[PDB]
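Schema walkthrough. Field components (list of strings):
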Amino acid sequence: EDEDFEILSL
Amino acid sequence: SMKFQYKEDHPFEYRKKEGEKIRKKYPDRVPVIVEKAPKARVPDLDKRKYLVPSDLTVGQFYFLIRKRIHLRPEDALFFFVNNTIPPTSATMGQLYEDNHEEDYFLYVAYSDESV
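Field assembly_structure (string):
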């Protein structure tokens, strides 16, 4: 959640 | 001409600075803003801004959204980007390359109706 952006993985 | 709240709530120059920063900080990811198409009869997605691996597929993103909003699995789910529905096997990186706006964000709407 960097700078209100949710960080997804895969 | 679908409205997106992140666009409705911020001026262009703010958005473009922010898209360029995040693209500089995470070069193998793309920033994506996702919102339900208005008056689609599906649950809303509360979190709207995502930083997604460029190799993530559309179908993988579908599956994540379906889980988050508790979509029943008989219900369909479609992405719209510039009025097109991408192939489920497309990558989000390719979708971003083909469709990102001049603020360096990709905007995605969704519905359970394709038409």
